[PDB]
Amino acid sequence: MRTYTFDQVEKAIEQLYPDFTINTIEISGEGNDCIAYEINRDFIFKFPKHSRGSTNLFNEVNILKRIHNKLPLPIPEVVFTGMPSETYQMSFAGFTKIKGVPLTPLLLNNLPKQSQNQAAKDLARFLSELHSINISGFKSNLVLDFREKINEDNKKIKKLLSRELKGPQMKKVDDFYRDILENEIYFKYYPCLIHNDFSSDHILFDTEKNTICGIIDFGDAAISDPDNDFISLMEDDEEYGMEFVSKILNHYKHKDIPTVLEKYRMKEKYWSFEKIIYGKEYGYMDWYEEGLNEIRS
Numbered sequence: 416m417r418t419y420t421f422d423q424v425e426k427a428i429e430q431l432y433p434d435f436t437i438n439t440i441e442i443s444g445e446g447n448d449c450i451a452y453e454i455n456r457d458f459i460f461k462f463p464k465h466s467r468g469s470t471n472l473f474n475e476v477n478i479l480k481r482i483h484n485k486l487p488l489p490i491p492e493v494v495f496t497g498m499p500s501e502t503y504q505m506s507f508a509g510f511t512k513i514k515g516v517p518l519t520p521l522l523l524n525n526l527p528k529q530s531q532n533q534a535a536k537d538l539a540r541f542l543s544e545l546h547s548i549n550i551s552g553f554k555s556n557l558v559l560d561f562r563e564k565i566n567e568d569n570k571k572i573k574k575l576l577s578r579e580l581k582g583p584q585m586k587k588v589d590d591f592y593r594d595i596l597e598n599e600i601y602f603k604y605y606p607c608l609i610h611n612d613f614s615s616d617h618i619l620f621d622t623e624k625n626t627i628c629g630i631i632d633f634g635d636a637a638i639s640d641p642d643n644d645f646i647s648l649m650e651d652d653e654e655y656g657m658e659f660v661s662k663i664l665n666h667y668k669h670k671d672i673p674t675v676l677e678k679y680r681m682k683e684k685y686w687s688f689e690k691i692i693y694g695k696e697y698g699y700m701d702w703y704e705e706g707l708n709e710i711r712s
């Protein structure tokens with residue numbers, strides 16, 4: 416992990432933008448890839464914390480320019496970009512701030528029932544449109560192969576868990592990667608452009624109008640299975656949960672909800688392995704062990 420001071424952020428922007436003057440800056444938020452800074456109250460700059468984040472910033476920037484003005488909800492416009500530096504593909508990026516507040520589960524369920532059905536229509540229409548974006552022009556770079564991803568993870572996990580479990584416990588992991596690979600329900604879909612982190616914190620809301628007013632955070636945007644954008648909403652408590660997602664699925668006119676449920680089920684179990692992989696990637700030894708712990712069951 417790398418760090419920035421406010422002055423490092425200022426002078427990093429002024430190098431590439433010698434006329435742009437910063438009057439106010441504060442930290443808007445921080446996630447696993449970038450720290451967000453709010454500058455002159457109308458712009459959000461992400462600065463990457465590591466080479467992986469930088470590449471997700473590169474891809475976000477690429478995807479937003481490319482889908483500019485084609486979706487039925489507002490999204491960030493890229494107004495500033497940095498450049499490669501050492502082991503970062505994109506040193507930073509600055510987007511217009513979309514106004515509003517996260518559409519939390521609490522905020523959503525505190526809403527009159529008609530505003531809830533509204534919001535669920537606005538989400539299906541957004542996804543209906545995001546998922547019918549023609550992808551012929553995207554580099555195959557950006558097309559997530561789920562087969563390869565699984566085999567990539569499997570080898571990393573085989574390497575990692577050889578130091579952490581014996582024969583019997585390891586068989587359970589062996590069995591789980593074999594079952595997934597040999598079930599075509601995970602690989603036989605119609606790829607499209609997906610947001611790929613579509614959850615309550617990236618759905619902005621306007622309490623004065625009481626309607627969704629923005630989608631943010633496309634850093635994970637890629638070509639892939641569109642069901643992923645429903646699965647990321649379904650977790651109860653942490654997310655909207657089944658009933659609300661089901662309304663979205665029906666405004667979208669999904670013809671196979673049971674298969675959405677079956678990919679949520681698989682993605683729920685799989686989460687243990689991501690925590691192990693990313694836990695030992697960054698240095699997050701509190702999730703390496705929480706991943707490790709669930710797996711011994």
Ligand SMILES: OCc1c[nH]c2ncccc12
Nearest residue numbers: 459491510512513631632
């Ligand atoms: O993901 C960064 C970002 C770009 N535009 C935004 N608008 C509001 C809140 C966050 C953002």
